[PDB]
Amino acid sequence: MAAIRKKLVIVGDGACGKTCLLIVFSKDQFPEVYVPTVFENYVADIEVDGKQVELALWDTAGQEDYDRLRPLSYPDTDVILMCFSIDSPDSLENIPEKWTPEVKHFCPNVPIILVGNKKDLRNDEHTRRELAKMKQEPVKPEEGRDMANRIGAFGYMECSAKTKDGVREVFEMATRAALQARRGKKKSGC
Amino acid sequence: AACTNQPHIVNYLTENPHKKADMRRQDSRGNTVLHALVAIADNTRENTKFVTKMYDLLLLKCARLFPDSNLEAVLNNDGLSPLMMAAKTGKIGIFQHIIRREVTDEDTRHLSRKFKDWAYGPVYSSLYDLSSLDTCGEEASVLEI
Amino acid sequence: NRPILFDIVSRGSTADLDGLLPFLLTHKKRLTDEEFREPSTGKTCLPKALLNLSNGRNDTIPVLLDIAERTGNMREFINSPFRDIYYRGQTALHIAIERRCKHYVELLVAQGADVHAQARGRFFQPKDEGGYFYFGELPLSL
Numbered sequence: 001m002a003a004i005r006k007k008l009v010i011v012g013d014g015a016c017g018k019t020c021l022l023i024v025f026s027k028d029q030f031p032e033v034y035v036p037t038v039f040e041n042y043v044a045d046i047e048v049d050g051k052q053v054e055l056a057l058w059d060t061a062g063q064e065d066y067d068r069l070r071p072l073s074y075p076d077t078d079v080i081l082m083c084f085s086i087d088s089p090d091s092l093e094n095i096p097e098k099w100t101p102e103v104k105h106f107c108p109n110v111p112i113i114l115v116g117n118k119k120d121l122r123n124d125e126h127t128r129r130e131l132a133k134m135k136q137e138p139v140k141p142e143e144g145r146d147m148a149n150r151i152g153a154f155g156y157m158e159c160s161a162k163t164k165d166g167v168r169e170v171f172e173m174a175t176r177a178a179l180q181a182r183r184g185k186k187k188s189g190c
Numbered sequence: 191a192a193c194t195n196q197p198h199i200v201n202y203l204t205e206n207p208h209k210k211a212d213m214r215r216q217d218s219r220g221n222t223v224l225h226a227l228v229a230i231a232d233n234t235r236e237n238t239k240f241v242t243k244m245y246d247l248l249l250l251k252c253a254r255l256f257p258d259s260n261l262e263a264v265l266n267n268d269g270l271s272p273l274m275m276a277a278k279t280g281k282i283g284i285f286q287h288i289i290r291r292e293v294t295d296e297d298t299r300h301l302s303r304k305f306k307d308w309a310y311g312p313v314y315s316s317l318y319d320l321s322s323l324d325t326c327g328e329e330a331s332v333l334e335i
Numbered sequence: 336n337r338p339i340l341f342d343i344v345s346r347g348s349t350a351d352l353d354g355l356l357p358f359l360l361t362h363k364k365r366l367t368d369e370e371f372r373e374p375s376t377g378k379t380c381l382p383k384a385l386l387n388l389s390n391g392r393n394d395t396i397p398v399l400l401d402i403a404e405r406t407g408n409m410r411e412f413i414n415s416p417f418r419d420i421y422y423r424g425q426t427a428l429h430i431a432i433e434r435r436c437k438h439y440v441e442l443l444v445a446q447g448a449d450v451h452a453q454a455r456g457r458f459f460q461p462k463d464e465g466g467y468f469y470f471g472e473l474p475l476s477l
């Protein structure tokens with residue numbers, strides 16, 4: 001009947017493919033030449049279960065001067081995509097230390113969905129050979145399964161923008177998380 | 191001439207090739223033309239209109255001829271100004287007009303007391319001036335009087 | 336070039352805009368760059384143009400829109416929302432509707448302006464809450 005508008009914000013460390021993920025959702029065409037540093041002011045139509053939802057997609061960066069303005073994008077957020085890389089293990093241990101407390105500081109009681117990018121790159125040989133120079137290995141999916149549990153993520157998934165695998169299901173899970181009404185209030189003052 | 195509602199006489203007397211009567215002239219009491227105009231001001235419907243018209247005309251002429259000095263600044267022996275004297279005497283008709291004085295003329299719009307800040311739809315926000323309406327002990331204030 | 340462009344658009348002069356497109360093409364600078372946007376509220380060229388104008392015919396809007404089209408960033412530019420608190424969410428369409436000019440509304444809608452954008456600034460909140468004007472936070476409602 002009437003589409004419901006929901007706010008989705010994607011946050012992740014640099015070069016993780018957040019912009020690529022949203023772009024592939026947008027036009028279903030991987031940009032192989034030019035990728036904007038941020039993809040902003042876009043609303044996409046999605047239907048999951050008898051409901052029509054307009055999802056407003058916001059991106060956050062910190063490459064240059066975007067960290068100062070990043071806080072402005074948090075308020076009135078309905079769902080968060082905590083995004084990281086499977087080909088870059090360093091993208092994992094930084095999620096709890098610095099990103100999570102900021103997320104809870106600005107926008108608490110908001111559903112958070114964990115996502116790892118570059119599923120194919122975890123099985124690549126050149127990436128493994130280069131990474132072994134520093135005694136490192138690709139991110140283990142089971143480690144992600146557990147890491148979702150630790151940070152209380154609503155759900156954790158994998159995406160591959162190159163082969164458009166799981167993008168639709170992942171963002172559908174994001175939307176179903178968003179439509180959820182949450183649980184009242186906790187320890188509400190008298 | 192001003193108190194008797196004779197604009198032509200005032201205009202001629204202010205600017206004459208032979209002699210000129212400066213508007214910033216004080217009598218023995220110290221009251222200037224604006225002071226006297228306020229003194230004879232009345233709350234009646236007819237009197238207030240001509241009082242305000244003459245006051246505005248004379249103030250504009252004085253500002254135009256002398257841009258450096260503002261006529262309302264002059265004080266009488268009692269130390270009051272036309273605004274303060276009107277407040278003390280209880281003459282609302284001229285007082286309210288003085289409070290919300292707005293000048294459309296670009297040349298001499300500085301002496302206005304009511305400005306327009308901005309309009310959003312039916313909401314209109316305007317910026318009044320209270321340079322002498324409220325004083326923190328520096329000088330007598332209209333409110334205390 | 337933010338101050339000069341702001342002054343040019345405020346004055347409504349159209350000749351001064353000549354040469355902006357070659358400059359953008361050579362420097363590859365988008366019209367939504369942080370430098371161009373006013374730091375105070377993220378205000379951009381278009382809302383400044385629509386705010387002040389003569390008889391509803393600023394006459395600078397079509398040139399700026401064509402420039403944005405050439406840059407290939409029309410969708411982002413037209414519906415760029417204001418940041419900050421007081422005027423959060425406000426867009427060009429709300430301003431065009433408020434100023435009672437049908438022509439600019441038609442132009443923005445045709446060019447692809449978002450029509451469901453919500454204005455949630457404190458100024459737009461109800462009277463008792465702190466906002467001096469409330470209209471449902473929608474273009475059609477406004």
Ligand SMILES: Nc1nc2c(ncn2[C@@H]2O[C@H](COP(=O)(O)OP(=O)(O)OP(O)(O)=S)[C@@H](O)[C@H]2O)c(=O)[nH]1
Nearest residue numbers: 013014015016017018019020061063121160161162
């Ligand atoms: N092997 C592999 N590489 C990918 C895949 N998707 C994206 N990459 C790379 O990820 C990049 C994601 O772009 P982007 O997120 O803007 O980089 P960034 O430098 O981290 O951006 P920023 O957070 O500093 S502002 C793309 O440019 C692309 O080269 C994939 O599916 N498989």
